[PDB]
Amino acid sequence: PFRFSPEPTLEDIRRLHAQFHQPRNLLLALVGEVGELAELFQWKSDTGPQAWPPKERAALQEELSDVLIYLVALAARCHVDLPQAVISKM
Amino acid sequence: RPFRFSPEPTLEDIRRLHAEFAAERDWEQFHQPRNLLLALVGEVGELAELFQWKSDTEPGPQAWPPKERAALQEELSDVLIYLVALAARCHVDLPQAVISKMDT
Amino acid sequence: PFRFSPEPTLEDIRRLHAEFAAERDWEQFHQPRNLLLALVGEVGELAELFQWKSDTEPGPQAWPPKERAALQEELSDVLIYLVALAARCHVDLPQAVISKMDTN
Amino acid sequence: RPFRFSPEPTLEDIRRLHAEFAAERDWEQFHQPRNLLLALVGEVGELAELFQWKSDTEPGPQAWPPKERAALQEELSDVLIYLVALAARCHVDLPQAVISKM
Ligand SMILES: *n1c(N)c(C)c[n+]([C@H]2C[C@H](O)[C@@H](COP(=O)(O)OP(=O)(O)OP(=O)(O)O)O2)c1=O
Ligand SMILES: Cc1c[n+]([C@H]2C[C@H](O)[C@@H](COP(=O)(O)OP(=O)(O)OP(=O)(O)O)O2)c(=O)[nH]c1N
């Protein structure tokens, strides 16, 4: 069916990519990848990404992770328990 | 002191959670790619609407008034709740797509 | 096959938005970045409105006046920060435009 | 210090030109609200990448190297061009909706 791999956990990805990496420089880099990610959708239409050519799907996973990696970074530097902070909202 | 994230939820855990709260709030339908995308973009917006006034030569995020750091967490979450939501919808295994990256 | 008004103009807008701001001493906050994050914060409200639509659907002309009135706001707050950004960047936003089309 | 903008083209003018441009390479089909939003949401990113690595009270844009200062224009140019086409595609009076907000 569909499923995410049991790891790397949010804690791994935090440990793994970790001056640049200060607060608002990281927030501008998050918005950037959201900018690349948003680009792989602009000239589409309502119909999904599960059926895109390979070089596209491949970029769809690439840019998507990038965003995570920075959101990861940004929060791990704002000292927010990204993982827990999620369930609390639930 | 070392600041580390807790163990779980796993991204897979973060999925199976949002995955259900809506399936009870009957959402998944409007949950179409761009719909999910465009949302992530409003939260990202809501995320920057805290740093747009703060200068990086300021008390930094850690040292943010409770209610600010509170909002900050409630925001960093949603940006994650939708990133993982968009991924799953694309059939992307966000967790593994990260490894393929490390393969630099 | 539509039309904007002849005014205001971008300097006319770039002008008042000066007067306006630093009339709330809102000019001390026009440092490139703070400004860039502000655009992103408003570039995000604008999305929050289209996260529920689809382009196969009738543009905001059919939207209920209330939804169609809040769309004029964001579209306007987005141009305002964009202008406040360009200016602090000493960019002739108006020329930078046309002098970018004598190309692609 | 305090900068100005040439008296034209006006917001409407830009509107037409882009049209001619986009009416040339059959790009109107490409201009559906959400397209120009994401289209714009993304140029704001390219525009975000520029400053991501820069700094608070460091050199500063206007003192940036040429090729960067030039890329900067590009990026600001684009953001408008899309703001202008979405605004237009939504049948929204962009210049006037800016005063009405004062
Ligand atoms: N509208 C539509 N629908 C389309 C397809 C295209 N345009 C024009 C207007 C806009 O200014 C230009 C995009 O130019 P670009 O593709 O070179 O900018 P960018 O992609 O960011 O440069 P790069 O080569 O991708 O790095 O297309 C419409 O108005
Ligand atoms: C907070 C603020 C506001 N400004 C002025 C300029 C914008 O054209 C107008 C819109 O402000 P905004 O706070 O974004 O209006 P709202 O969107 O309704 O605010 P929120 O609902 O809280 O997002 O405010 C401004 O110049 N600088 C500044 N630091």
Nearest-Cα residue of chain B relative to residue C50: B38
Angstroms from D39 CA to nearest CA on chain C: 11
Distance from CA of C101 to the nearest CA of D (A): 8
Position B19, amino acid: A
Which is nearest to B51 in space by CA: B68, B39, B34?
A: B68
The whole-angstrom separation of Cα D65 and Cα C63 is: 46
| Ligand 2 pocket member C80 (CB < 6 A) | yes
| CATH number, domain with residue A56 | 1.10.287.1080
Q: Cα separation of A11 and C93, whole Å?
A: 43
Which tokens hold the place of B73?
A: 């967490």
CB A45 within 8 A of CB C55: yes
Q: What is the DSSP string of C45-86?
A: HHHHHHTT--TTS--TTSS-HHHHHHHHHHHHHHHHHHHHHH
Q: Which two tokens stand for residue B84?
A: 């993982």
The C-alpha atoms of residue B32 and residue B41 are separated, in whole angstroms, by 14
Q: Which residues line ligand 1 (CB under 6 A)?
A: C 104; D 18, 22, 27, 30-31, 43, 46, 78, 81, 85
- Segment holding C41, helix H or strand E: helix C32-50
* Nearest Cα to Cα of residue D19 among C77, C49, C4, C50: C4
Q: How many CA within 13 A on the CB side of residue C35?
A: 24
Which chain A positions have a beta carbon within 8 Å of B6's beta carbon? Answer: 11, 81, 83-84
Cα C67–B89–B26 angle (5° rounding)?
55
* Sign of the alpha-carbon torsion through D36, A55, B95, A80: negative
SS (H, E, C) D41-56: HHHHHHHHHHHHCCCC
Which chain D residues touch B56 with a CB distance below 8 Å?
55-56
* Nearest beta carbon to residue B34 from set D34, D56, D57: D34
Spatial CB neighbours of D4, under 8 Å, sequence gap ≥ 6: C11, C14
Task: For residue B55, give Cα distances in angstroms to A63, B6, B50, C34, C39.
Answer: 28, 29, 10, 7, 16
- All residues at 6 or more sequence positions from C98 whose CB lies less than 8 Å from its CB, including other chains: D9, D14, D17
Measured CA distances, C31 to A68, C74, D67 (Å): 28, 21, 21
Residues of B in contact with D55 (CB under 8 A): 56
Is the distance from CB of A73 to CB of A17 less than 8 angstroms? yes
Question: What is the crossing angle of helices A23-39 and D33-52, to 10°?
Answer: 150
- CB-based contact, A28 to chain D, within 8 Å: yes
The partner residue sitting opposite B56, judged by closest CB among D38, D41, D56, is D56
Please give the residue of chain B at the shortest CA–CA distance from C43. Answer: B45
* CB-CB contact of C94 with D9 (8 Å): yes
Q: Which domain holds residue D101?
A: 1-102
Judged by CB atoms closer than 8 Å, whether chains meet at C82 and D76 is answered as yes
- Helices C10-21 and C65-88: crossing angle in degrees, nearest 10, is 90
Query: D17 in helix, strand or coil?
Result: helix
Q: How many domains does chain B have?
A: 1
